[PDB]
Amino acid sequence: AQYEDGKQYTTLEKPVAGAPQVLEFFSFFCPHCYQFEEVLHISDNVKKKLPEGVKMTKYHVNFMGGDLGKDLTQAWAVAMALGVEDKVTVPLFEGVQKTQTIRSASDIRDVFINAGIKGEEYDAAWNSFVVKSLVAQQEKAAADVQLRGVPAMFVNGKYQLNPQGMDTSNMDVFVQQYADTVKYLSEK
């Protein structure tokens, strides 16, 4: 066929019950993830093509960057809890990978402050149990699919995108193939 198991996607031989419909994993330490977000805008082109009533979820992972990697998972929980993802994603990526000015949890916090989140609001969130549970959720989702690499995307806990089976000659064409593949899997 045109879309084939083992080509544009793989099927989980251990499907995950109750998973989010479209679930994307990344790390702010992850170089292809920076490309995905900053250059290719994968999440966004996927969203523009998803059917009505299919929600999108994005989680951070621990297994890159050690101690700071874990801090970033907690900061991403803060971002989700406050609904400020679209304000901190770019400066976090550039802070870790471009300027390399993020070396501590305090440096992460500065990004939120600069983005206009109040210090007390950030600290309150950081220390909150709603954020602890949001961190748990991120960890559990990744554990459920035995995740060992990012970027990664999963559809309905059953299918995993396989971008290595797609032409990268043109960046635009790759993104639409990726998005179109997600839509196809979504309709499966």
1-188: CATH architecture? 3-Layer(aba) Sandwich (3.40)
Dihedral sign computed on CA atoms, order 158, 161, 162, 165? positive
DSSP conformation class of 38: I
Tokens found for residue 91: 């400066």
Tokens found for residue 79: 């971002």
**Whether 74 contacts 109, CB under 8 Å:** no
CA gap 127, 81 in Å, rounded: 12
Query: What approach was used to elucidate this structure?
Result: X-ray
Radius of gyration of the chain (CA): 17
Instruction: Determine the residue type at 148.
Output: R
Resolution in A: 1.8
Task: Let me know if 111 is exposed, middle or buried by CB neighbors in 10 A (0-12, 13-18, 19+).
Answer: buried
CA gap 122, 51 in Å, rounded: 34
3-state secondary structure of 10: strand
CA gap 58, 153 in Å, rounded: 9
Task: Let me know if 63 is exposed, middle or buried by CB neighbors in 10 A (0-12, 13-18, 19+).
Answer: middle
Beta bridge partners of 58: 24
